[PDB]
Amino acid sequence: PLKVEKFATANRGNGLRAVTPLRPGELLFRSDPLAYTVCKGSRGVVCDRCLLGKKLMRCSQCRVAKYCSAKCQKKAWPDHKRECKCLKSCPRYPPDSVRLLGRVVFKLMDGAPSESEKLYSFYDLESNINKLTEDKKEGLRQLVMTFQHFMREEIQDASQLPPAFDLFEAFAKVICNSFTICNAEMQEVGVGLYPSISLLNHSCDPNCSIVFNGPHLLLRAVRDIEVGEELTICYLDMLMTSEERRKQLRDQYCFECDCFRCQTQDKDADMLTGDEQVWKEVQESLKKIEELKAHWKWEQVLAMCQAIISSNSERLPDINIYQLKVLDCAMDACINLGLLEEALFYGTRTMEPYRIFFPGSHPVRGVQVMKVGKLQLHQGMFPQAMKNLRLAFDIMRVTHGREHSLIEDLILLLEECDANIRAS
Numbered sequence: 001p002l003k004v005e006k007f008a009t010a011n012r013g014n015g016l017r018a019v020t021p022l023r024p025g026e027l028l029f030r031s032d033p034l035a036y037t038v039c040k041g042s043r044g045v046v047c048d049r050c051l052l053g054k055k056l057m058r059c060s061q062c063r064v065a066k067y068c069s070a071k072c073q074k075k076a077w078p079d080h081k082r083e084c085k086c087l088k089s090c091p092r093y094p095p096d097s098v099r100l101l102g103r104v105v106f107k108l109m110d111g112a113p114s115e116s117e118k119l120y121s122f123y124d125l126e127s128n129i130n131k132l133t134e135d136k137k138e139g140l141r142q143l144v145m146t147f148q149h150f151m152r153e154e155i156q157d158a159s160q161l162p163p164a165f166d167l168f169e170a171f172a173k174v175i176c177n178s179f180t181i182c183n184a185e186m187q188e189v190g191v192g193l194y195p196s197i198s199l200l201n202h203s204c205d206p207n208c209s210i211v212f213n214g215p216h217l218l219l220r221a222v223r224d225i226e227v228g229e230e231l232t233i234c235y236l237d238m239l240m241t242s243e244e245r246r247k248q249l250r251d252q253y254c255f256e257c258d259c260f261r262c263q264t265q266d267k268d269a270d271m272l273t274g275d276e277q278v279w280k281e282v283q284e285s286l287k288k289i290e291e292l293k294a295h296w297k298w299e300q301v302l303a304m305c306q307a308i309i310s311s312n313s314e315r316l317p318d319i320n321i322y323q324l325k326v327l328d329c330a331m332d333a334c335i336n337l338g339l340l341e342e343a344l345f346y347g348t349r350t351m352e353p354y355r356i357f358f359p360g361s362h363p364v365r366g367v368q369v370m371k372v373g374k375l376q377l378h379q380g381m382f383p384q385a386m387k388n389l390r391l392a393f394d395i396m397r398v399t400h401g402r403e404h405s406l407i408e409d410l411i412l413l414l415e416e417c418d419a420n421i422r423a424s
């Protein structure tokens with residue numbers, strides 16, 4: 001009995017709406033990908049199959065796919081068999097979108113009908129072809145030729161593609177339907193297509209949220225929702241100004257956002273507090289920090305972050321979004337490096353900015369608060385840790401739910417912390 005249904009919206013194409021009233025935290029849909037792959041930065045760092053970090057065993061046929069276990073290498077083999085011959089035939093490694101579309105084609109040609117397409121299929125996806133600028137068309141033509149080069153060993157002619165399959169159109173669909181898969185710690189680790197979930201239109205203040213548990217996607221309501229009300233998710237990172245959202249929503253998704261937040265530049269001024277010269281430099285440095293982070297080089301991430309957070313030169317308020325991103329990278333680097341006191345220093349500083357920039361129930365705040373409460377618990381700060389773990393649970397019961405394994409870990413921390421308070 002589905003609680004959601006496809007419908008034709010007035011000015012946003014197809015959408016998803018509530019069949020019945022929905023309450024915060026209600027599970028609305030869950031889905032494996034139609035196709036997914038590890039991202040360029042996480043390649044060789046996380047398992048190709050389960051998307052969990054580490055050493056990894058390489059496929060000896062292609063030496064590109066890496067796995068956490070024999071179970072994962074063997075289980076991945078059917079969906080890897082055909083791309084394996086392509087990865088071997090090409091030291092060149094394809095763009096993520098090309099490896100993704102390869103797996104789309106193989107799944108559609110060789111796999112049983114996918115539950116991921118239950119409400120909406122890859123064939124159905126929006127392409128926005130009549131909104132593409134010439135520069136985007138040129139980029140898509142390059143992706144098509146990259147695909148044809150990469151796949152030459154396994155796809156020679158059109159009989160090896162789905163009926164009336166057009167590669168240009170397929171990449172156009174990929175551009176505006178790609179989901180950024182994040183691990184439990186909210187690190188981007190992959191990209192996937194989830195065609196049923198692709199029905200959800202975007203809002204900068206959405207009433208639903210998606211969370212990933214490995215490649216598996218949970219869709220949950222994060223607000224009360226009335227019968228027939230349209231379901232929305234935020235396609236974008238919350239730590240973005242309306243100008244940045246405008247550029248991404250145009251470039252990637254070919255639409256102009258009419259929401260209250262965009263009409264009022266909601267929070268932009270707070271996000272850009274501090275000295276423009278300083279945060280412009282921090283924004284520029286974040287390109288390298290995030291690239292270093294995408295490749296899990298935590299020591300180099302921390303060094304760059306410390307040079308900003310404890311700079312001898314002018315500094316930024318923690319509510320400035322570029323400063324805040326630097327604090328988050330520093331916290332995660334310290335966690336992965338075992339520098340738990342320093343991790344807590346940075347994490348605690350993010351708490352009030354996160355409260356402001358992740359209103360309501362957002363999985364990124366839930367995870368962040370959980371990390372801080374876990375750090376406080378390990379340092380013996382039981383009453384402080386309990387408050388944060390309870391807050392993390394209030395959020396993550398809505399954004400993650402019992403179906404997400406991270407909720408089980410949080411429950412164990414709550415139980416450990418409460419036992420400590422009771423023994424105190």
Ligand SMILES: C[S@@+](CC[C@H](N)C(=O)[O-])C[C@H]1O[C@@H](n2cnc3c(N)ncnc32)[C@H](O)[C@@H]1O
Nearest residue numbers: 012013014126176177198199200201202253255
């Ligand atoms: C993942 S699809 C969402 C479902 C889509 N409406 C469809 O018909 O298949 C993303 C595309 O939906 C449209 N879209 C999503 N959110 C929108 C919004 N808030 N306003 C206008 N168009 C939107 C844009 O065409 C965008 O590229």
Ligand SMILES: NCCS(=O)(=O)N1CCC(NC(=O)c2cc(C3CC3)on2)CC1
Nearest residue numbers: 176177178179180182186234235236237
């Ligand atoms: N570290 C970042 C964690 S995040 O939760 O903020 N995040 C940022 C937003 C991201 N969302 C998407 O990729 C996405 C794509 C779509 C439709 C298909 C176009 O809908 N959502 C998930 C990860």
Ligand SMILES: [Mg+2]
Nearest residue numbers: 124125126127
């Ligand atoms: Mg269409």
Ligand SMILES: [Mg+2]
Nearest residue numbers: 013128130131
């Ligand atoms: Mg259109």
Ligand SMILES: [Zn+2]
Nearest residue numbers: 047050068072
């Ligand atoms: Zn694995």
Ligand SMILES: [Zn+2]
Nearest residue numbers: 059061062084
């Ligand atoms: Zn291989």
Ligand SMILES: [Zn+2]
Nearest residue numbers: 204257259262
């Ligand atoms: Zn908006």
